Write a protein that binds this ligand. Structure first.
Ligand SMILES: [K+]
Ligand SMILES: [K+]
Ligand SMILES: [K+]
Ligand SMILES: [K+]
Ligand SMILES: [K+]
Ligand SMILES: [K+]
Ligand SMILES: [K+]
Ligand SMILES: [K+]
Ligand SMILES: [K+]
Ligand SMILES: [K+]
Ligand SMILES: [K+]
Ligand SMILES: [K+]
Ligand SMILES: [K+]
Ligand SMILES: [Mg+2]
Ligand SMILES: [Mg+2]
Ligand SMILES: [Mg+2]
Ligand SMILES: [Mg+2]
Ligand SMILES: [Mg+2]
Ligand SMILES: [Mg+2]
Ligand SMILES: [Mg+2]
Ligand SMILES: [Mg+2]
Ligand SMILES: [Mg+2]
Ligand SMILES: [Mg+2]
Ligand SMILES: [Mg+2]
Ligand SMILES: [Mg+2]
Ligand SMILES: [Mg+2]
Ligand SMILES: [Mg+2]
Ligand SMILES: [Mg+2]
Ligand SMILES: [Mg+2]
Ligand SMILES: [Mg+2]
Ligand SMILES: [Mg+2]
Ligand SMILES: [Mg+2]
Ligand SMILES: [Mg+2]
Ligand SMILES: [Mg+2]
Ligand SMILES: [Mg+2]
Ligand SMILES: [Mg+2]
Ligand SMILES: [Mg+2]
Ligand SMILES: [Mg+2]
Ligand SMILES: [Mg+2]
Ligand SMILES: [Mg+2]
Ligand SMILES: [Mg+2]
Ligand SMILES: [Mg+2]
Ligand SMILES: [Mg+2]
Ligand SMILES: [Mg+2]
Ligand code: NA
Ligand code: NA
Ligand code: NA
Ligand code: NA
Ligand code: NA
Ligand code: NA
Ligand code: NA
Ligand code: NA
Ligand code: NA
Ligand code: NA
Ligand code: NA
Ligand code: NA
Ligand code: NA
Ligand code: NA
Lengths: 129, 141, 140
RNA sequence: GGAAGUCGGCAAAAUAGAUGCGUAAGUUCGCAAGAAGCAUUGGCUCUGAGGGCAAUUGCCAACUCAGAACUGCUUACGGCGGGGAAUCCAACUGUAUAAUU
RNA sequence: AAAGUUCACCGAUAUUGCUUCAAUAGAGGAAGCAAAAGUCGUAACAAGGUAGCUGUAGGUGAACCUGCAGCUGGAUCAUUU
RNA sequence: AAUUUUACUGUGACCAAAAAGAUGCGACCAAAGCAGUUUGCCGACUUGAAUUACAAAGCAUGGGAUAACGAAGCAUCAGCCCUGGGGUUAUGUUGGUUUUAGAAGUCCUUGGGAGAUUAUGGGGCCGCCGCGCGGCUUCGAAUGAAGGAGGGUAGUUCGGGGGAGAACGUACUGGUGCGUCAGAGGUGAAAUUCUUAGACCGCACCAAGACGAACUACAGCGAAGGCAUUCUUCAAGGAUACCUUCCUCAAUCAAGAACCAAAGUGUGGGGAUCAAAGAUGAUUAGAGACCAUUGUAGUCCACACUGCAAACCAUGACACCCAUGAAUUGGGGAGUGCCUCUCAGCACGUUUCUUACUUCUUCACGCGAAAGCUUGGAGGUUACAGUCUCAGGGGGGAGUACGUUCGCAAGAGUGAAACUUAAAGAA
RNA sequence: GGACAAGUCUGGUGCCAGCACCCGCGGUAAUUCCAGCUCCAAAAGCGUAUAUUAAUGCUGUUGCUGUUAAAGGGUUCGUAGUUGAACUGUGGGCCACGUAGUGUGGUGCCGUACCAGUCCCGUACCUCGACGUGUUUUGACCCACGCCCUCGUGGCC
RNA sequence: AGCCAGUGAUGGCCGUGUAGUGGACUGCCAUGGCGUUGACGGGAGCGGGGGAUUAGGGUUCGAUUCCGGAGAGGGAGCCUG
RNA sequence: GAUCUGGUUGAUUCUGCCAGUAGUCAUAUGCUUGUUUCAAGGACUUAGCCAUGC
């Protein structure tokens, strides 16, 4: 069955970007999905998205702009210390000049550049470049 | 996929987004509860009660008017069935298969289907015992 | 794909332990059967006594006689066949002498076109067979 | 001394009750099995367990089993399997030449 | 207060018997792998001259043959609109 | 009274040396070692820093991802405040007979302010089948229903799905009754075989056992193995329809269980056809084979075993995304032909939809060593992470030996090594 | 000779003697054997044997393979184990101006187009009075930002 | 793939021995304790601080100078402290 | 320093192992050795047997 709705949504988005579409529909969506999207939107990687409400888990329509190359979840959510940020960057990123590794800390979901500034750590969620 | 087979079916019901009653209904909440209580007194199951109201009284989604589900209404009035209705209906089917097999010993296909039904009973009864809907140390046979 | 658990280290450890017996290299170093069958009890060299001098033919595409000797070891009285290298060098061996024997390379596998020979003669009468060949020493 | 006797261990010797432990190959899974083998055992003075009936008390009956201290042997009625490894034949219990099988 | 007597306890050592592990001889009966190509054939590779192969049962100097069910990895992707 | 715990993350606590990283100093450099430097005196500056640590342990910060408890909701019901009543301490000290009055407990009653669910309905009579009035006494607050699972109702829906009966159809073989007269059968060619004691052939019947042609397909049903005449029966299964019910009940699996083509085994039946073993005739250098005539076990049924197949799609199960065009099977929604009752019916034409078997030569992207795969992918993978599980590790020895479990047996499962070889293999 | 830096040099042997870790060389002209001469590597050092680490993504957690190369169990059920859907919520004002995109209104509305008019074709045009740009300027959004908030409503004040 | 109980196995009660607690031990009582999260048995082996190899993850060695344990040919008893 | 090369074919693209290559306070044996500094040295097998002195 469906075990991870975060892995699902990130697979739909990277799939639509590979084909060349302009919009995607994502189900069933959740709080973690929305907070992950806001991190990509704030860095200027997707564009406007909207949440349609049924009296269930909703659906999300996301507009693309041809900037995303790949996005994927990391499973299982390993643990990262503030000194361990580089090791993850060397492994799952094309270069250290650009890209992001999204973590969940006790402050909240946020990428590794912001996490280093606040000097925290936590469990990795995914990445995008 | 079905849990004990190879069917991929999708037939189901889709519930409306607007939960408010449709303002042509009349039949205040007190009258609906009376009708539910009258029907259950005749031995109808919770599922059969929802059907009768739907097909003849204009009441669709009894929860939307009176705010209470059908089983909760029956439990409050103390007329709920002794065992849950899904478990009861599975047990009835397994009994009829076993009665058939006592005269037809070569029916190896019904023997295979009986294994599937009783595996369903043991999985269901394990759940009802964990959520205390059945007495502990309740056994099918 | 495979198991990806975060609580499945037991399954992954059992998998690697069972599947590690499948490579002949790793199995040879943890099984003790090789040492017993090896005439050298896991040693670089061994000392023995020459029994007789034999000449074994080479394998099919080649054609020669390889000038071996039959040696009975001292530490366990096992009989092996060893090859005496370099031109001549058979006249320096004689009978009933005492020799030092080493491996041929490849760690028990036969070498070259010599059928089933995996040992070579190094020292005869504790002087050195190559030193005798180069005339740097004289036979005692 | 220990089968050297004799066609041939024939005849004799030999084992032996009970209790605790322990018991192989083979097998038709029932057996083989008391396989094989080891230990204890007397006398005297005590202790514990195992019940019934009347109102916690009183009275009363049966010998079995377990344990301890002391003390002794000249190994001391009768009665009571010797054991093991194999080959041939017949599956087995049974019958059968009264008076040589 | 030594020598000595009796009993309990710890217990070396020996004999006997079981149990277990590691090495070892053996008349005969077989198997594998090499060497030389010695004898007899031609089962497979082409429709290999009876298409081949899997499972099973029987037979026979040798490769093998025969019956039953299956497969194409076939020698056919195909012919009452 | 009250009165949450764990993992993860930040910073402290707590940690012999040697070794390891390193902070300082030309031991002539270096491997080292903690020491050493003053343009000179009765001295001065002095150093020898600071780190780490598989996991567990210990104070305290957050609360995002997590997991441990609890509940299964009618198993629950309980305003708050304010009067006013009814019913140990001191007594200078010690020991007792004493007691203040309080505080609790209950039962009464007086101010007020709240309420997350209207006090309404019933009992309720009379006079005007209904009809309001008068006095009246009596006794609804819970997240939502997953394009996850289960159950229900309906078309008495759909189909070579399964088990039982009763019949039907020609055909092979053997009989019976008539007719006829010299050959028939078989092969590349023949010969074993049958035949004036009437074979073969023709017509009509009888018995027995097996099997259901054509229709029959890149069609249907079943977990796989499998399943094909009709009628009557018994219990099931999937898809579709639904503003029915329920509320995480789920996915996948060591151990364990049930089923499983053909051949084979045991005990009773049955015995038409075909046919391992065997027997004859040919062919051949030979022929134990292929071909011909036969023929036992088997082939069929019931009840017990066995548990192996190229048991194959040589492709494990669950979930998501993913380009097109024609077809086909079942259910549902929205001009034409037949039409006195399994009939407000049945087929067809046009457009949508859910499920199933797939096809493209005018089918993507993409992937692959290639052949090829492509909406049950062999794609979305060095831009490598959705979840679970079963196997592999150069070719042989070998699925062999020994031990053990199961089996009446045949066998099945588990399963090495010594030796030997540079290739074997794929497109 | 190649891997691997370094001779198509000169004598001897003739599938012999021997080399060769692997591929291979030697049957009368041997780039490979036994020697002479040159040369190459590294050097007070340098060969050989055995074990072990890296080469090895040939043990794969990072990170393998299973249609045909070795490898998916005959099919279902099933316990321990491993993995498991969404939800209770991440404020509001003013500051002040910097900045900031949307749309919002209005502002001028040139120049062109367009709209309604005049001459008037044809069966084209010419004249005359708003509609649309694009100059400015409102409303929210966000970024720079100090304070306050009984930081939902109440109920106090 | 089961292990442990006569003759101590898991616990209880008064006791005894020890420096002291304790099933360490005597008598009595109960029926427990451990195990597919691998008990019981077998093989190799003194623990650690650490060495070798090093993109990273790892693989391997450690009798040996510091710390701990054990022994004095084999195995048992004991005096003095 | 995050590196690879030779062998299956008449040629080609693969799977795959054999062989090459660098270390080792890691042991042993062979050949050869002027100076100096720092150094391990009967564990491996037999916790085998021991003259004499301390
Ligand atoms: K299923
Ligand atoms: K016996
Ligand atoms: K066959
Ligand atoms: K249904
Ligand atoms: K006739
Ligand atoms: K039939
Ligand atoms: K025949
Ligand atoms: K198989
Ligand atoms: K269908
Ligand atoms: K297709
Ligand atoms: K192609
Ligand atoms: K077997
Ligand atoms: K591989
Ligand atoms: Mg005599
Ligand atoms: Mg006698
Ligand atoms: Mg026995
Ligand atoms: Mg006895
Ligand atoms: Mg008899
Ligand atoms: Mg007589
Ligand atoms: Mg033919
Ligand atoms: Mg042939
Ligand atoms: Mg053939
Ligand atoms: Mg140091
Ligand atoms: Mg649901
Ligand atoms: Mg006939
Ligand atoms: Mg038919
Ligand atoms: Mg059969
Ligand atoms: Mg039979
Ligand atoms: Mg029979
Ligand atoms: Mg026949
Ligand atoms: Mg592949
Ligand atoms: Mg991968
Ligand atoms: Mg292999
Ligand atoms: Mg070498
Ligand atoms: Mg040449
Ligand atoms: Mg290695
Ligand atoms: Mg399969
Ligand atoms: Mg099987
Ligand atoms: Mg969740
Ligand atoms: Mg040792
Ligand atoms: Mg040692
Ligand atoms: Mg020490
Ligand atoms: Mg090949
Ligand atoms: Mg020693
Ligand atoms: Na399942
Ligand atoms: Na008898
Ligand atoms: Na300095
Ligand atoms: Na120096
Ligand atoms: Na230094
Ligand atoms: Na197939
Ligand atoms: Na298979
Ligand atoms: Na076996
Ligand atoms: Na080919
Ligand atoms: Na590597
Ligand atoms: Na294969
Ligand atoms: Na030493
Ligand atoms: Na000592
Ligand atoms: Na000694």
């Amino acid at each position: 069955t469906m075990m991870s709705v975060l892995a699902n949504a990130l697979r739909c988005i990277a799939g639509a970007e590979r084909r060349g579409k302009r919009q995607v529909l994502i189900r069933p969506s959740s709080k973690v999905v929305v907070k992950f999207l806001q991190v990509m939107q704030k860095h200027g990687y997707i564009g406007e998205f909207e949440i349609v409400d049924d009296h269930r888990a909703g659906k999300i329509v996301v507009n693309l702009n041809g900037r995303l190359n790949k996005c994927g979840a990391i499973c299982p959510r390993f643990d990262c210390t503030a000194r361990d940020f580089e090791k993850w960057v060397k492994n799952i990123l094309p270069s250290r000049q650009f890209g992001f590794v999204v973590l969940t800390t006790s402050l909240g979901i946020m990428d590794h550049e912001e996490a280093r500034a606040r000097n925290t750590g936590g469990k990795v969620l995914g990445f995008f470049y | 996929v079905r849990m004990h087979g190879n069917g991929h079916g999708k037939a189901a019901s889709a519930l409306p987004y607007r939960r408010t009653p449709p303002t042509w209904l009349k039949s205040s909440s007190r009258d609906v509860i009376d009708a539910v209580c009258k029907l259950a007194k005749k031995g109808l199951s919770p599922s059969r009660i929802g059907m009768q109201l739907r097909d003849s009284m204009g009441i669709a989604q009894v929860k939307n008017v009176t705010g209470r589900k059908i089983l909760r209404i029956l439990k409050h009035k103390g007329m709920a069935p002794e065992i849950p209705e899904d478990l009861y209906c599975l047990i009835k089917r397994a009994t009829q298969m076993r009665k058939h097999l006592e005269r037809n010993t070569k029916d190896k296909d019904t023997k295979f289907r009986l294994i599937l039904v009783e595996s369903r009973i043991h999985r269901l009864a394990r759940y009802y015992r964990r959520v205390k809907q059945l007495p502990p140390t309740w056994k099918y046979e | 794909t495979k198991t990806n658990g975060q609580h499945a280290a037991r399954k992954l450890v059992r998998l690697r332990r069972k599947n590690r017996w499948a490579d002949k290299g790793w199995k040879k170093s943890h099984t003790f059967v090789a040492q017993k069958a090896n005439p050298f009890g896991g040693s670089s060299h061994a000392k023995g006594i020459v029994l007789e001098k034999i000449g074994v033919g080479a394998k099919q595409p080649n054609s020669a006689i390889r000038k071996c000797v039959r040696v009975q070891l001292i530490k366990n009285d096992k009989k092996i066949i060893a090859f005496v290298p370099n031109d001549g060098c058979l006249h320096f061996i004689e009978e009933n002498d005492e020799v030092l024997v080493s491996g041929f390379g490849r760690s028990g596998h036969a070498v070259g076109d010599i059928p089933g020979v995996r040992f070579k003669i190094v020292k005869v009468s504790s002087v050195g067979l190559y030193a005798l060949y180069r005339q740097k020493k004289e036979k005692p």
